[PDB]
């Protein structure tokens, strides 16, 4: 019998205390290896998080099966468009730092 | 002269087409007893007694009268009603359930539920049984204390958005804690077993903490942080 | 009539009721591997076994050692020698094999230092047969006996294919050449009515309490089953014996238990003084529930009483210590403060002697199988059985024993199935059922339904409650009990009078309520007029004007030197009541009370005495 | 009969019948955490919206960072607008933080009673307008 609802639940929490842990450790040195970490601890929290939302409102299998399939796409165009803009720009930590001094 | 108005839902299957409504009762406060209770069954006894609606031990301890009074749910035997004759006591059914008439909701859902976690010992040798009571520590039982009491009035369970939004396969706070009733029993055997049941994004899972369970316990008990204390169980337990 | 669907069903057995009596029957006959059906007006957790406080009796010995043949001698000396020792015997030798049983089952009973079920002291035991002081022997879940006792029971009746009609009210029985075939019974659901039927069928349908105005029994305590036999001509035994516990709530009449007084608990009057050693010198405020009414009663009579009314009496908490009333009584705790506003450790409770528990019912072996008395003799009814507290195997008699119910429920429950299990194989043949049989249920059924009558149901109800009340009360005498029958008599006439409103089939709680005051008037109509018959002050049942209490030989003076009255003139006798359902006649007879034990060198015969606590 | 018969028994009786559902938000007793908890979805979609919003603008619209700043440069840097829209983005970021940590004590079995509840409630709230008012101004 294998445990995998659990796994998952135990992921959730492990996530949440990070992405707590990196936003007070962003703003102390915000680093280019820094704006990686917090893009990737950032796009998984926000794919489970709206992956609740999916499985407790969206009703039936026909829906089921798009809306998981529509996170997941929205997921990876997230995380590799945060990726583009740490690679190629400022990246996200100075990107804030010169938002903020406006 | 006293007089309180009780604004009730009403429905009736033998009516062809009957639309779901409320209807008014106004009572004499002198002459009737301090719980919503004793005004249903007067009202029931004395103005209409097409008013339907489950009641037995009128003690709370049943859990027949189970409805949703002035908003939360409740044992109509146990709230007495507010004696501030300026404002209206509404009365309904237990929230989100197919209603059979009136303030009868289908519970049978529910009740198959508390069905599927198996609420029985188990041991794993069950040939010795009725021979020699089972040893428990004093200790040990005190473990059960705030579990056992719950009467399976369904007000928890009914009060949950998530069991609202997935009452199908998610179990609800009801169920749940008399699941985690049998697993600390110092005296079962089945506690792996019974923790790898609730293994689905569902039966356990659907739950977030929105306490509105334990808010609303009639006896007062805490479904709400028994289920936390499952979810903890869940990843802590190895094999 | 011809407007009903009717659903037929085929059984092995069917137990109508799913209190503790009828779970542990059913699950037991499933056990035994009988397709049974269980048959109940509500949900077997809504049933009056739930509110159940006190305990359950069992002489295993936890606190100190004990036998269970001195728990025996305390019921027979409880019954006032009423009591048939034949069924006593056998509850009683079971009481430590059943009660450890349940706890195997997972009734999570309270425990002690050395890991075993928590037993106290409980209202009339003793030990060393009424010599050894004190007896602590009831077994308990802390406040919540009853209600763990049902739960459990219900989540052991899981594990099989037991079949259970949950919310199906149960009109009368498939009766057929004296034979029991099964049960016509009403769905509440969706109106309809369901002919089950079985080769075997199980009463359990418990007390009818709702007779009286003031009980401390559920709303739904209304004797159906033993109404069920009387209108199928079969007697009803000892009705005439209510009891009436001493401790209820002043209000709605709700029950603080007898636990209260077995953990240091004391029942004070209006002028302070602990009057239960005024009249009970020896057990003091731990006597027998008949004793303490008395008492109670003939206190109130005096003058002496507590509100603005002055008609009740107080139990007193204010000395016991805080930290035994959160762990052993947590029950009452909430139930005084809700309903009475009375915190129980700074202030006392209102009490009051009410209608608790009914040891009469539907005539029993210790087997378990229904009697009819032919020929001044007793036999079997072929295929109907009765066990809990619509039974009288009168393990109870003229009193019941405080902590005894709920043993009587398992024992008796068991025994049902036992009966059942060593007497058949599961697949005989089911007897097979005339076309038309159950006519007059569905008849009765119909027009019940559209009753356009002039008395509410209400009001007759109330008049039956009061007149109750009134007339058939903890004392009662010859004059007053007299227009009490002419009352009651004339209640039922009106019957045809009354008026219904809900017309609906799903959930017609109106109907139901009416079809329970049918059953309730033909209970109560057969408590009183046995009542005024008895000329006797034997346990509960206590006249005026015939204060002695009339055995075949006088007990107090020595035996032998005496000749022995006949049948015919004394009183140690169960009553028998028949009622012509048409014109409501009460016909009553008599049977002797069974003296002889399972076995005299195992459990000696304890002879009638004086009795007094 | 089987716990799971009984369920498809519910299902099929009651779907294939004129049983009205019971009215549940429309009547239901509105306390404080149950309308946190609400707060905290909403501000967990429109934040995960907001990441992906910028993410996903990064990878289709064209020009850089340093020049997407600049047009919204020249359209008047009023005080009391400017502010406001650097607080109304800091807003939901404070309060599904500290409401979060309230989650994370939950998950380890505290603070659990309902008094703790509305205590911990308040704290959430009054830590989120102090943080939030306080960012503003960083
Ligand atoms: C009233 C009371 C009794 C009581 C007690 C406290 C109170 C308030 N505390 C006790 C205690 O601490 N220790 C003890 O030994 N006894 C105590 N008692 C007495 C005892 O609890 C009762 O005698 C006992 O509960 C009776 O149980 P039984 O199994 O015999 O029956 P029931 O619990 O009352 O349940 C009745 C069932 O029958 C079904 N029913 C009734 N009528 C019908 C019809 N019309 N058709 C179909 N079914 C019917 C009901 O559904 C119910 O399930
Ligand atoms: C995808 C991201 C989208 C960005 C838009 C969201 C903007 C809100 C971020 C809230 C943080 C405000 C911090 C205020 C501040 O003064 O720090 C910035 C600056 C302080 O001066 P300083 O020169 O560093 O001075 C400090 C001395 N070392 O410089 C830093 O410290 C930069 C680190 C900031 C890390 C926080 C990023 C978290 C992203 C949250 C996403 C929310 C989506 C909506
Ligand atoms: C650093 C502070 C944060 C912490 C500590 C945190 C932690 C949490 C926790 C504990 C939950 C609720 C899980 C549960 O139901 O038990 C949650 C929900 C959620 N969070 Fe966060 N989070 C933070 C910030 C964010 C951010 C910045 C985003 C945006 C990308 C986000 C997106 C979500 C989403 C979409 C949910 C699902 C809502 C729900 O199921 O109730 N969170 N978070
Ligand atoms: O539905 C939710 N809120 C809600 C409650 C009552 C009415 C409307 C919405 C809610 C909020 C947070 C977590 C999970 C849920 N849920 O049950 O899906
Ligand atoms: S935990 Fe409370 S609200 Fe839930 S079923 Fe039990 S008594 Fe009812
Ligand atoms: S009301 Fe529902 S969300 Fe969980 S703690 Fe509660 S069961
Ligand atoms: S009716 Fe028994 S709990 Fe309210």
Redesign the interface.
């Known amino acids: 019998?294998?445990?995998?609802?659990?796994?998952?639940?135990?992921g959730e929490?492990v996530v949440?205390?990070l992405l707590?842990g990196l936003?007070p450790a962003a703003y102390l040195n915000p680093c280019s290896a820094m704006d990686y970490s917090l893009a990737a601890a950032?796009?998984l929290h926000?794919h489970w998080?709206?992956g609740?939302?999916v499985?407790?409102?969206v009703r039936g299998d026909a829906l089921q099966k798009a809306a998981k399939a529509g996170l997941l796409a929205?997921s990876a165009?997230?995380?590799?468009?945060?990726c583009?803009?740490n690679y190629h720009?400022?990246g996200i930590c100075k990107?804030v730092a010169?938002?903020?001094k406006? | 002269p006293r007089i309180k108005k009780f604004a009730i839902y009403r429905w009736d299957p033998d009516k062809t087409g009957d639309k779901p409504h409320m209807q008014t009762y106004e009572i004499d406060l002198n002459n009737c007893g301090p719980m919503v209770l004793d005004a249903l069954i007067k009202i029931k006894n004395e103005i209409d007694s097409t008013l339907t609606f489950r009641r037995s031990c009128r003690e709370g301890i049943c859990g027949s009268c189970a409805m949703n009074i002035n908003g939360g749910n409740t044992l109509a035997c146990t709230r007495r009603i507010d004696t501030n004759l300026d404002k209206v006591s509404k009365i309904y059914p237990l929230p989100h359930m197919y209603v059979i008439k009136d303030l009868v909701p289908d519970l049978s859902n529910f009740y198959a539920q508390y069905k599927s976690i198996e609420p029985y010992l188990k041991k794993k040798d069950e040939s010795q049984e009725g021979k020699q009571q089972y040893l428990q520590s004093i200790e040990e039982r005190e473990k059960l204390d705030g579990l056992y009491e719950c009467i399976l009035c369904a007000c928890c369970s009914t009060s949950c958005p998530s069991y609202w939004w997935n009452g199908d396969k998610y179990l609800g706070p009801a169920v749940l804690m008399q699941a985690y009733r049998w697993m600390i029993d110092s005296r079962d055997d089945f506690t792996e077993e019974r923790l790898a049941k609730l293994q689905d994004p569902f039966s356990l899972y659907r739950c977030h903490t929105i306490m509105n369970c334990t808010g609303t316990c009639p006896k007062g008990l805490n479904p709400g942080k028994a289920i936390a204390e499952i979810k903890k169980m869940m990843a802590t337990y190895k094999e | 009539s011809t407007q009903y669907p009717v659903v037929d069903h085929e059984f092995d057995a069917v137990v109508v009721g799913a209190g503790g009596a009828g779970l542990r029957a059913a699950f037991g006959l499933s056990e035994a591997g009988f397709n049974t059906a269980c048959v109940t007006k509500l949900f077997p957790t809504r049933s009056h076994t739930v509110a159940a406080q006190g305990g359950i009796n069992a002489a295993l010995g936890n606190m100190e050692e004990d036998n269970w043949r001195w728990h025996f001698y305390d019921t027979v000396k409880g019954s006032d020698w009423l009591g048939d020792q034949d069924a006593i015997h056998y509850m009683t030798e079971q009481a430590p094999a059943s009660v450890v049983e349940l706890e195997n089952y997972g009734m999570p009973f309270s425990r002690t230092e050395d890991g075993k079920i928590y037993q106290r002291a409980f209202g009339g035991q003793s030990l060393k047969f009424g010599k050894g002081g004190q007896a602590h022997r009831c077994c308990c879940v802390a406040d919540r006996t009853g209600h763990s006792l049902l739960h459990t029971l219900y989540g052991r009746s899981l594990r099989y294919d037991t079949s259970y009609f949950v919310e199906y009210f149960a009109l009368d029985l498939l009766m057929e050449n004296g034979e029991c075939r099964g049960v016509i019974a009403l769905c509440i659901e969706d109106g309809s009515i369901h002919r089950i039927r079985a080769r075997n069928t199980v009463v359990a349908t418990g007390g009818y309490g709702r007779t009286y105005f003031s009980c401390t029994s559920a709303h739904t305590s209304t004797g159906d089953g033993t109404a069920m036999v009387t209108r199928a001509g079969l007697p009803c035994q000892d009705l005439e014996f209510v009891q009436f516990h001493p401790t209820g709530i002043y209000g709605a009449g709700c029950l603080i238990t007898e636990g209260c007084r077995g953990e240091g608990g004391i029942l004070i009057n209006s002028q302070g003084e602990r009057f239960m050693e005024r009249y009970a010198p020896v057990a003091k405020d731990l006597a027998s529930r008949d004793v303490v009414s008395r008492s109670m009663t003939l206190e109130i009579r005096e003058g002496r009483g507590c509100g603005p009314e002055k008609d009740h009496v107080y139990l007193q908490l204010h000395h016991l210590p805080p930290e035994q009333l959160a762990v052993r009584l947590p029950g009452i705790s909430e139930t005084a403060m809700i309903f009475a506003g009375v915190d129980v450790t700074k202030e006392p409770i209102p009490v009051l002697p009410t209608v608790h528990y009914n040891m009469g019912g539907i005539p029993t072996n210790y087997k378990g199988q229904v009697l009819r008395h032919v020929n001044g003799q007793d036999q079997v009814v072929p295929g109907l059985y009765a066990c809990g507290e619509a039974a009288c195997a009168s393990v109870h008699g003229a009193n019941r024993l405080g902590a005894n119910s709920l043993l009587d429920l398992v024992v008796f429950g068991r025994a049902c199935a036992l009966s059942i299990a060593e007497s058949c194989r599961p697949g005989d043949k089911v007897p097979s059922i005339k076309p038309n049989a159950g006519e007059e249920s569905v008849m009765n059924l119909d027009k019940l339904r559209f009753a356009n009558g002039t008395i509410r149901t209400s009001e007759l109800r109330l008049s039956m409650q009061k007149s109750m009340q009134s007339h058939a009360a903890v004392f009662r005498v010859g004059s007053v009990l007299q227009e009490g029958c002419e009352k009651i008599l004339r209640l039922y006439g009106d019957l045809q009078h009354l008026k219904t409103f809900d017309r609906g089939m799903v959930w017609n709680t109106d109907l139901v309520e009416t079809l329970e005051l049918q059953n309730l008037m033909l209970c109560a109509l057969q408590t009183i007029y046995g009542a005024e018959a008895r000329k006797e002050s034997r346990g509960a049942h206590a006249r005026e004007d015939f204060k002695e209490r009339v055995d075949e030989y006088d007990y107090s003076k020595p035996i032998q030197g005496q000749q022995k009255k006949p049948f015919q003139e004394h009183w140690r006798k169960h009553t028998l009541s028949y009622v012509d359902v048409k014109t409501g006649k009460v016909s009553l007879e008599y049977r002797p009370v069974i003296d002889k034990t399972l076995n005299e060198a195992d459990c000696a015969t304890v002879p009638p005495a004086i009795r007094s606590y | 009969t089987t716990a799971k018969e009984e369920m498809e028994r519910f299902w099929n009786k009651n779907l294939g019948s004129n049983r009205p559902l019971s009215p549940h938000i429309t009547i239901y007793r509105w306390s404080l955490p149950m309308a946190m908890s609400i707060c905290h979805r909403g501000t967990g979609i429109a934040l995960s919206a907001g990441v992906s919003l910028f993410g996903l603008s990064a990878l289709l619209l064209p020009g850089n960072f340093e020049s997407h700043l600049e047009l919204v440069k020249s359209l008047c840097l009023g005080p009391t607008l400017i502010y406001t829209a650097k607080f109304g983005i800091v807003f939901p970021l404070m309060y599904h933080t500290w409401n979060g940590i309230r989650h994370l004590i939950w998950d380890l079995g505290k603070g659990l009673t309902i008094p703790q509840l509305t205590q911990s409630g308040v704290v959430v709230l009054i830590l989120t307008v102090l943080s939030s008012v306080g960012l503003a101004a960083m």
Request: proline share 0%; hydrophobic share 55%; glycine share 8%.
């Open positions: 019998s294998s445990k995998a609802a659990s796994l998952h639940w135990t929490r949440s205390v707590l936003l950032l796009t926000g998080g709206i609740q939302v499985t407790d409102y929205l165009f997230t995380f590799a468009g945060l583009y803009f720009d400022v990107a010169m938002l903020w406006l």
